[PDB]
Scaffold this active site. Structure first.
Site, PDB file in Angstrom:
ATOM      1  CG  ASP A 110      51.951  14.421 -53.834  1.00 35.50           C
ATOM      2  OD1 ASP A 110      53.005  15.042 -54.030  1.00 35.50           O
ATOM      3  OD2 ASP A 110      50.866  14.697 -54.392  1.00 35.50           O
ATOM      4  CB  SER A 160      67.789  26.272 -55.311  1.00 35.37           C
ATOM      5  OG  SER A 160      69.078  25.926 -55.739  1.00 35.37           O
TER       6      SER A 160
END
Length: 330
Positions: A35, A199
């Site tokens: 994770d 992004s």
């Protein structure tokens, strides 16, 4: 040193991925959910409330000659999906894919919430976010990657998740045969303890690319892709019959649909998520309403590049003094 381990989807939807991990002496092998959105290595154990164990493999520290109680240490964690676990702490030897850390904090669960009990395929979590998020008190503990870093050939790990197929986590090296083209690296903020990056935009299907900054986290422990409501609305508007259902808890679409791809930007590069990756199947067994793999982050407080996005790429988690993320197509 290096390590290399295969990671396998837990079910036919790629809801999560499990990687075998050796704990203790002699080795006890548990299948853990790696994770990158949390920083605790915790396991089902001989200390877990018996009614809360339903098919998981447990760690028994009393059978490990290298286990030592970390006296006074406790841990307690809550995840973004509302699940939680807590317990005490041992140090022990932990190996992943041939890479060994001695003195790793292994957090032994005394309690786990229902979602963990109900998933017999996940024996615990191995956190790979930054150690500043580790919940051990009163002495915070380091992740497996942080402990291994100095010994690694290069201070990196990579995630190569498969679509309906096994993939690989590598530690200490970048497998240049595992991706196509070049790796594009992008800056990371560790201020929130996550692999947080920006992004450069998105496209829906064959549509034109929209240049817009989207701050979010690379999180192998989250199944879906959670993005701003504007972006998610633009995606689902291209699917006839798709709608956001408050009763179901997100966007659904007719199972008869063919989904468009979704592209996200990494600097000047582009990662394309095929439409099929966004299909999470019937909302309930036999339904013709299917659950979407792109959902709004509006209720979270952060955008999450979960498995739907990450499995479309070869992803480098660069833990150098100034961390960065790298993305390649594959």
């Amino acid at each position: 040193s290096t390590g290399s381990a295969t990671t396998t989807p837990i079910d036919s939807l790629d809801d999560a991925y499990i990687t075998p991990v050796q704990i203790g002496t002699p080795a006890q092998t548990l299948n853990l959910d790696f994770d990158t959105g949390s920083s605790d290595l915790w396991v089902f154990s001989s200390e877990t409330t018996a009614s809360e164990v339903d098919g998981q493999t447990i760690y028994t520290p009393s059978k490990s000659t290298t286990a030592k109680l970390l006296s006074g240490a406790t841990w307690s964690i809550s995840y973004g999906d509302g699940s939680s676990s807590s317990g005490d702490v041992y140090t022990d030897t932990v190996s992943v894919g041939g890479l060994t850390v001695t003195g790793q904090a292994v957090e032994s669960a005394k309690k786990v919430s229902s979602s963990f009990t109900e998933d017999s395929t996940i024996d615990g979590l191995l956190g790979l976010a930054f150690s500043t998020l580790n919940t051990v008190s009163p002495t915070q503990q380091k992740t497996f990657f942080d402990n291994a870093k100095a010994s690694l050939d290069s201070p990196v790990f990579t995630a190569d998740l498969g679509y309906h197929a096994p993939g690989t986590y590598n530690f200490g090296f970048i497998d240049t045969t595992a991706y196509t083209g070049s790796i594009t690296y992008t800056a990371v903020s560790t201020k929130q303890g996550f692999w947080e990056w920006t992004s450069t935009g998105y496209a829906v299907g064959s549509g034109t690319f929209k240049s817009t900054s989207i701050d979010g986290i690379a999180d192998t422990g989250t199944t879906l892709l959670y993005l701003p409501a504007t972006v998610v609305s633009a995606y689902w508007a291209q699917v006839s019959g798709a709608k956001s259902s408050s009763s179901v808890g997100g966007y659904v679409f007719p199972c008869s649909a063919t989904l468009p791809s979704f592209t996200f930007g990494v600097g000047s590069a582009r990662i394309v998520i095929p439409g099929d990756y966004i299909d999470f199947g019937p909302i309930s067994t036999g339904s013709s309403s299917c659950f979407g793999g792109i959902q709004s982050s509006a209720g979270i407080g952060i955008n999450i590049f979960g498995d739907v996005a990450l499995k479309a790429a070869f992803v480098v988690f660069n833990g150098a003094t100034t961390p960065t993320l790298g993305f390649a197509s594959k």
